[PDB]
Design goal:
314 residues, five-stranded mixed sheet, 11 helices, elongated, hydrolase
């Protein structure tokens, strides 16, 4: 809604202190949206006290540094929460302790928090939403500098797998063309985002070398504590390799099992057949081409295999 954007801008102009949050375990969109908007606002309003809070993600810390803020600073502040569908996943819970709370998000509005709400499930990403907000904001004095442009671009390219994933829309590409005109180095950004440690590359090589496809295009990957130790990689490092199998000729759908301390993490992917159903059956869920689940025994993994084989066969 056009009016909704205008009301956010007006409300932002009214408060001297603005504190910005996003979701725990931040990703590129969390940074692009939260820090992108933070940097718009630092540039546009150098007289305001603008802060971005939360725990940093070391692999994204090259984008922006976060601030430490006292309890007192919240008093009478505007708090903006970017890219967090669920209140309980907001990094730093002092979010409702200000005078007002604003929600900006691109996920379904199941937890409709905030005094102000701008939710749009047609946007690729919240970083895209922030660029759209800026477009309007312009007319009311907002300024986009090079650092903000870069942040929003980083958020968009991270969240869409550089215009690959199906959340990419006409708007995404259009805004990216506008953003690329700012004088930041996109090639250096891509280098930083894709930089991978030799030991994670080698683990990826171990997975590729040993992968096999069923006659029906199903594939599975088991990364237990012993493999993690051999390669010296964390569980999250190994899990993040689930996307790397997508270009294999004839693959239909596949799954990763990563042994963590408390569960076995399960990541489902598909090039066609719906996997939602299968995920929900083992207590998880997600989208039709990308779901997850937690399981507690290797027996449970073999059942997920048999069902994956069938879903592919049909």
């Amino acid at each position: 809604m056009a009016s909704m954007k205008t009301e956010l801008i007006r409300t932002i102009s009214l408060y001297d202190t603005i504190i910005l949050h996003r979701h725990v375990r931040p990703d590129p969109d969390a940074y692009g949206s939260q820090c992108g908007l933070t940097e718009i606002l630092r540039e546009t309003y150098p007289e305001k006290n603008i802060f971005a809070v939360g725990t940093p993600e070391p692999s994204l810390s090259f984008l922006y540094s976060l601030d430490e803020v006292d309890n007192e600073t919240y008093e009478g502040a505007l708090v903006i929460v970017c890219d967090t569908a669920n209140q309980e996943r907001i990094d730093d819970q002092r979010y409702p302790s200000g005078a007002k709370l604003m929600k900006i998000d691109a996920h379904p509005n199941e937890d409709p928090y905030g005094d102000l709400l701008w939710v749009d499930t047609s946007a690729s990403s919240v970083s895209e939403m922030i660029y759209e907000l800026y477009l309007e904001g312009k007319e009311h004095g907002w300024k986009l500098n090079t650092k903000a442009a870069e942040l929003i671009y980083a958020g968009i390219v991270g969240d869409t797998g550089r215009f690959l994933f199906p959340n990419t829309t006409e708007k995404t590409l259009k805004y990216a063309g506008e953003l690329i005109q700012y004088p930041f180095s996109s090639s250096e950004l891509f280098n930083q985002l894709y930089e991978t440690k030799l030991n994670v590359v080698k683990l990826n090589g171990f997975i590729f070398q040993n992968v096999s496809l069923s006659e029906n295009g199903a594939a599975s990957v088991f990364i237990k504590k012993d493999t993690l130790e051999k390669f010296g990689t964390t569980a999250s490092e190994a899990s993040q390799l689930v996307g790397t199998l997508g270009n294999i000729s004839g693959i239909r759908a596949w799954v990763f099992f990563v042994e963590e301390d408390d569960q076995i993490r399960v990541r489902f992917r598909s090039k066609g057949p719906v996997i939602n159903g299968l995920a929900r059956k083992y207590n998880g869920g997600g989208h039709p081409l990308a779901s997850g689940a937690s399981i507690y025994s290797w027996d449970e993994a073999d059942r997920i295999l048999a069902d994956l084989e069938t879903l592919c066969k049909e």
